[model samples]
Target: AVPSPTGTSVKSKNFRTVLYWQYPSMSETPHFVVEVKPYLSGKYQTVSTCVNISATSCDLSEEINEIFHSYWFRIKAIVGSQQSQYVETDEFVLQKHGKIGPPKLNLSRHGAEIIVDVYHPEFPSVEVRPWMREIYSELSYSVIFRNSENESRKNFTVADCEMNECNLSIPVPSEGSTYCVSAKGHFFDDLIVGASSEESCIWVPI
Candidate 1:
């Protein structure tokens, strides 16, 4: 099933909107069409026609306008004039969601507690658009503490992780136990995640 393509934006003439979906067995996105439907019953207006496949993403920035009404995105694959089924995307109201990247994470220990700092990748000041600023405003941290021996684990989301930093003072599953911690940043608006940080561990003595 061709679900809504995972999307993210980049610095393209301000910002180049990108949409990338997958085919069941194939990865290359050959000849495809990108369209938009602003109204529920409205027909999809051809926004981008017969775009390159290997790019893996389609740029629909030119037709993106009036972020007010909700818009629908649907894609169709074309192989030498053969058209596949129309694949639709999830609800794409700008107010609801947009291109969001995953957060960079760091972890450390302070005695009995664990400290996590989640942050976004840095970009040039000149290229950080207002939309990007909205994403950075409320970025947060999530830390998962798991026991090394078993499946026991504790999931923690630091609510007030202002500036992408937070501390977890919660006790581990066991004392004098070894554990691993996984961390990632969450988008404040939709909680859409990019990539999680690499796993790291710490030991506490009894």
Candidate 2:
């Protein structure tokens, strides 16, 4: 087990969590046990235990929240009766649930076409399937030419594609003019619950 720095982050909702411990001497140990205890009175209350030989980390299940109002984690190396010291981690604050943030959009020029890239930190599992509107349910884009009252339009949904990245391209207007691009995103199921990226505008003098 190679000891390495441990860290953790929250997902789907607003919460703080911790990922700790690295086992540099894992190969010699063959197996490991992870224990979690909750803070109580002046001592800790054992709340959970797991036996594993492969996994280095585990997600603290909802049961952890139910059993203890507060909890901490520690890992022990098990090898015949010789148990290693208890390497404990700092406490983490758990949230009731997780939340997905608004999608972020980036734009770049590829020859005569404008490409827009959209990314989200947390999208639902179903959103990654083909023909799923929720995947692209909340994305829209428009292009407007400078010195003209008209706006060129294109409207379509992004397929439920499992990618950390996606791109949309639109033909550029004639040279010697400026153009503006805008996009918005919505929740896959509840269109009412979502956010839009700040409008990104570029002036093209071609």
Candidate 3:
């Protein structure tokens, strides 16, 4: 008897949605068929890119284009004439379930002002990655500045972005001090707060 795929789940982050499952214990490689019951659809349709695929994970980002709709997915393993039972996933909503990512933090000190340049999140190390801004239009960022010398911290929220990036000038507490800054993204409509960026430091000139 062929074993069905185990640990079936849908993971969405930074607008890249993917379906993942564990390969069954078997000597022969078994292909999989993935089907999606899209928003407002009663019938399940086989995913074109995931059908008859041997991989344990399939990217559903392109197929899940509806920004505010719910979705469901199911997958089964097949080996020749034998097939496993279908594994169905829970309902997925991009706006509610999808997680946002931190913005890229770039800091510079200009006299008494610290310049923070926030860019969209996209991991260069990741093979299949997409920018957060491309998937979300109503976005904002929270910037936090910390002073190393005095241990003073301040927070600022940029209500909206300018063009594609967010550039803000924050006044420093003291001259000849080191300040660190980090940023986090947010989708205000759904209140989705994302991971925070690494703290970057810059020294203010006296």
Report the lDDT tens digits of candidate 2 across residue range 1-206.
33322442323231123233455544455455666665555354443445654456555543243211456666656555556655666554332232334566676776666667776655423333333343344433222222232555445444334454556776665644445554444333343233455656655555
Candidate 3 lDDT, tens digit per residue, 13-80? 87778999998566777999999998777679989999999899999987776667789999999988
Q: Count backbone overlaps in model 2.
A: 16
lDDT of each: 0.57, 0.47, 0.80
Query: lDDT of model 3 at residue 48?
Result: 95
Candidates sorted by lDDT, best first: 3, 1, 2
Q: Is candidate 1 or candidate 3 better by lDDT?
A: 3
Best by lDDT: 3
Q: Is candidate 1 or candidate 2 better by TM-score?
A: 1
TM-score of structure candidate 3: 0.86
* Candidate closest to the true structure, highest TM-score: 3
Error of 2 at 138 (Å): 10
Clash pairs (backbone) in predicted model 1: 29-53, 102-194
Candidate 3, position 146, lDDT = 88
User: What are the runs in model 2 whose C-alpha is more than 4 Å off?
Assistant: 1-100, 122-156, 187-193
Distance from true location, Cα of 156 in model 2, Å:
4.2
Which lDDT tens digits does candidate 1 get at residues 1-206? 43333342322222245566664335544466677776645778876443545454666655555334566677776654456766777666543454334455565667766666565544223243444545455555677778887668888776554443455665655568777877665556334444556677777776
Error of 2 at 187 (Å): 4.6
